Subunit: 175 residues, 6 copies
């Protein structure tokens, strides 16, 4: 099942992301249920917004907020919910939310899957417009949700991204 | 796997539906295989018709005809086959088919997923046109299928819907 | 899970195919991981080409190249990745690739799923244009992939298709 | 604009059809306004049905109901509304409704657009499923429209189709 | 062509709207060029948002900003760009931006196109979610455009909507 | 109509392209009829390929093959057939086929439509993958057409592109 995917062939440089929400999809927020492995509807989003990249998580990781590390993966075409993609982390979007700090990684497809992202080694190599669309989306997609808000602190580099993965993987085994 | 989803957090008011066929999809009739949990093609439908709502079943229930209770769920956007949605039962469409009585529940998304259906508490609160499209679809979608026919008896209320769930859940454990 | 589907109700006349890539989809090459049962991205294809039929494999078979037998299934509408369809083998496309001989079966939906393919009993009954599009696709879809090439030897009949299934099923149990 | 398209290169054997409604689309009935040439929404269909082929009309023709001759055209992929395709007539579906006699022609793409329809010379050459689906669709698509009914009388051959085109083309000059 | 469509059968109660951008589409801002009547790409939107309803304009109207009156029209399924739909005005959204006062009307499909909107007579009859989504969308869609801002002032009723249509239709003759 | 669109705001640096075939669409070759201005189906493509960018033409230009200059235009999302987009020429693909020399221009969206293409000034600035996909597509899309062949000669720069536009625009007046 999806519950049995490895975090990575060679963490933290080489990771697998389980995709929950495709890029440019209808505003349905899917999540994988950690008990069954099944795709569940978490909610229907109320803003007219879509994820600018595919979104999901790295399995067998536990971040400080209790869930697996979440990741945005740009792809040339949207992926299926439930599918697993081999990626390399490239940066981290840091936010503070109603429950305090949040981080969302950005990871690009592994060169085995595509050469299109070989030149993106770090957070400065992502297109500016994509980064602005990512930040704008996380600032506004919960606007019409009562008692929730998000605010962006800014981007950090591939090394900071890798540290969050390691820290949350090691955390997942004992805790 | 999908075989391990609960019937409901709090049956029969608060149930999960496993979606087999999305609303307004191509005419492929999917079903979840009760042995593997996999999505199987049951058939390619022969009429030019589509399901007016998403269609699936409540797991761990056994109706009188031998299969789990089947349910129609209206959503603002079509869901993925295989996905699980939290719903509240609101009514029941009663039919008599070649093997005698059939019932199909209608359930709307739980208010945790969406507020759009909060005002629909019972079968009279569904839009008339949706109900007519549901009845018309079940009357005609097997028309070009040899030795099959369906005829609608009419709508019953949320309490009748809930009784079918309870009866078919309790039936599933001993039988 | 998908790992537990049977090869067939009555091999080799009556088989199940697990679909990995839908017909006329975006150029993402999915594959089912044999460890988890999950859908993985194998790669993003680099040519502007799509599979002319749905593509997947018969489970519990092992061909000479180490993977399950792969199959093309024409359907009236594209199927979902992950779904399982009941088929009858009708022919085989024989190729020689960089690692030598390759065979890809063609199988049509079982008459229980559709009557549309009842008249196709053998490889000569497939439309010429479909067969030419299949051959052309396998000749060119790896063109922009370094160190890979394919060349078509030609079509064989339903009996040859069935022999490959039997041989690869029997091979899968001891080997 | 679309008001100036010819009826055909060589009536009645070689015609153009102006497509108003694609096969397999959402239940929106488009029509070309004969004053502007623009695509108008005539209505949203109220049954959960879709047209089994593309649908539109031959320009510069006037049938006895006052409207241009309407044509159903199967294609390998749905066409865009407003596009014009070159076709050959093969058949006619005769019907009666609450306004009188109706007839819909069936036309396949001209061999310069595709060779896929070259074996289709007459009405008995169309796939049986397709004929059944077209008839079923006209008998039921207006079922939830108060006061409307459709009775299908039977199929007529290519010669009959051709006669109708000539008649309605001569009738359009003439008036 | 689209330049010759009328403003309405019976202004201001019964209007036509020329649709430029479908609900829920890719982030492409189309507009009709008033010289050619052709669909032009005005820009690719830079936020990850989509229009919550179809959007376009009433022909032969001139508002004080120099452009035809623009209208938002909800429908059961997205419309094609360039298509013309018959509608009734129900409301107006008033706004201010970096060029002045703006107003966008809201119109629902005419009862001859669908009875689904018959209970919607005025602005307080629109679903609250839909009103909130429309307002949120105008306040944020230009956020990544340097120098542009949008402030939403509030909703006005059907009478106000109707007044604007009459004013801008008389203003278009007149000039 | 589409026959009256200008060639460009400021030829040859700032042009309009009339889009006939969207990127990544079904294998339908549309063209604008120069007599009506309407979209005609020229053919259904017989290979399982799709255009890697949007494709169309610059109006009021005549190339030596007798047809308007054709242009490939990459965009973030596929455009509608019949829509007109403002672009800057960056390159030319030269080819030979069974009728002579061909050339296809490459143009990117004008900076008023998107800043995403501002770093693309010349042919060596296009992504290598995209150039390879375009060349591969012209060499193979007509492979199953008897008597047709395409040989790709190489890329030429923006200056060469610009020269072709001026030449063919002057040649269209002139004749």
């Amino acid at each position: 099942s999806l519950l049995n995917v490895p975090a990575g062939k060679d963490l933290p440089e080489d990771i697998y992301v389980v995709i929950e929400i495709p890029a440019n999809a209808d505003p349905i927020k899917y999540e994988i249920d950690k008990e069954s492995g099944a795709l569940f509807v978490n909610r229907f989003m109320s803003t007219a917004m879509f994820y600018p990249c595919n979104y999901g998580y790295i399995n067998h990781t536990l971040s400080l907020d209790g869930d697996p590390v979440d990741v945005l993966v740009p792809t040339p075409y949207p992926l299926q919910p439930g599918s697993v993609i081999r990626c390399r982390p490239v940066g981290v979007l840091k936010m503070t939310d109603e429950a305090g700090e949040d981080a969302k990684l950005v990871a690009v497809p592994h060169s085995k899957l595509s050469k299109e992202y070989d030149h993106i080694k770090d957070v400065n190599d992502l297109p500016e417009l994509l980064k602005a669309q990512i930040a704008h989306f996380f600032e506004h997609y919960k606007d019409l949700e009562k008692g929730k808000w998000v605010k962006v602190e800014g981007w950090e580099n591939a090394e900071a991204a890798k540290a969050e993965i390691v820290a949350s993987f090691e955390r997942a085994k004992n805790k």
